Amino acid sequence: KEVPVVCEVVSEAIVHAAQKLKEYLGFEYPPSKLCPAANTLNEIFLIHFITFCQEKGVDEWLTTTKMTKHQAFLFGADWIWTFWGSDKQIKLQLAVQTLQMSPESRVEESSWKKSRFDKLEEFCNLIGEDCLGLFIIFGMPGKPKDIRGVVLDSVKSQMVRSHLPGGKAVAQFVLETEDCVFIKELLRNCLSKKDGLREVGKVYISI
Amino acid sequence: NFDYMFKLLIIGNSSVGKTSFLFRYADDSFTSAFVSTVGIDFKVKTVFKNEKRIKLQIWDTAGQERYRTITTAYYRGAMGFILMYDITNEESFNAVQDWSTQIKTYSWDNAQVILVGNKCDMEDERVISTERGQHLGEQLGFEFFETSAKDNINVKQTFERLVDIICDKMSE
Ligand SMILES: Nc1nc2c(ncn2[C@@H]2O[C@H](COP(=O)(O)OP(=O)(O)NP(=O)(O)O)[C@@H](O)[C@H]2O)c(=O)[nH]1
Ligand SMILES: [Mg+2]
């Protein structure tokens, strides 16, 4: 059971990709355009992550699936990390949505005016108990190069008492929460046995 | 600038060729690199029948059982189904009855269905005969095609027959 090796490698890959991404965060060119595209940031992060994992030889236990445009719209997720056990079964899926904090076009009129937060919630509900929603925030007000993480269930616990819509509630969570947990410990807790779902509590994920 | 919009879903076991089938119909191309579909996806394509402009919203579903709940959640509003098995895979053909009951369960209102046995280019690896497939189609009341997404055999025919029988219904 090689849980520790993949846990360590994936957490270090996340940290490494975040470090590589920090170079591009905060770029603003007033004479033309004041932001890199969200897809561009996602792709830079994913490229560095995937290359790190490939060099560490964990491709048999982790698969990264980048959502298409249609899939990102429908699911509210920008990518998905699938963890495989030695029995070649899926142990855990992380559906990841990225935010900044400083659309469909091929669909006729339906009830798809739902927010990204709620679509991610519905996606994780439909996949099942071993699928976790995760938000990664690229940049904070006053800290453009700060990268932070939040588990969906923690945001749910916060909105129980705070009564805000999901999207704003994530921002208020990363702005009001000072307790944190490092990505490595989270990764361990969700893989040895699927516990992190209703476990993380009132912390953010420090990258 | 369309007269009708038809929602079609491609369903069936993993590896039977569903994504390849859609890719061939919509982009006139084929790839041997098997990449399993996560959840569901869709493409769109415009066709013309009797001067009518029809937008097809073709949904490609995931065959793995882990994605059953999500895929069945997208059956709602379906006007057409392509139920795919792989003529070289006995398991995929045995599962056809279950797929049919799922269509009837999550799409109670009458949606037209085409039964498709894919990979007919693989004659040396055939385990399901053509007559077995058409007899199953007759049993379930479905039209039947044998197809190859790789060699582009009966792909356009499948989709156009689906459009035909959807247009024959609703004409009352
Ligand atoms: N010989 C042959 N191979 C085919 C044909 N269609 C697909 N394949 C091959 O079969 C494999 C699976 O194709 P794919 O379209 O991904 O099947 P799928 O139904 O979408 N799988 P999933 O449900 O997991 O998403 C690929 O290696 C593909 O090249 C065909 O008509 N002939
Ligand atoms: Mg597929």
Numbering used by the authors:
A (entry chain A): 15 to 116, 131 to 235
B (entry chain B): 26 to 197
Verbatim from the authors:
The structure is composed of one Rep15:Rab3CGppNHp_Q222H_10-227 complex per asymmetric unit. The structure of Rep15:Rab3C reveals that, unlike most Rab effectors, Rep15 is a single domain globular protein which presumably explains why the other three deletion Rep15 constructs were not soluble. No electron density was observed for the first 14 amino acids, the middle 117 to 130 amino acids and for the last residue. No electron density was observed for the first 16 amino acids and the last 30 amino acids of Rab3CGppNHP_Q222H_10-227 (bovine). Rep15 is composed of 7α-helices and 7β-strands. The central core is made by the β-strands which are flanked by the α-helices. Similar to all known Rab:effector complexes, switch I, switch II and the interswitch regions of Rab3C are at the interface with the effector. They interact with the α3 and α4 helices of Rep15, constituting the primary binding site, with a second site being composed of a loop (residues 115 to 145), ß2 and β3 of Rep15. α3 of Rep15 interacts with the switch I and interswitch regions, while α4 and β3 interact with the switch II region of Rab3C. Analysis of the interface by PDBePISA40 revealed that the Rep15:Rab3C complex has a total buried interface of 843.4 Å2. The hydrophobic patch is composed of switch I (V63 and I65), interswitch residues (F67 and W84) and switch II residues (Y92, I95 and Y99) that interact with the hydrophobic side chains of L88Rep15, F89Rep15 from α3 and F151Rep15, L154Rep15 and I155Rep15 from α4.
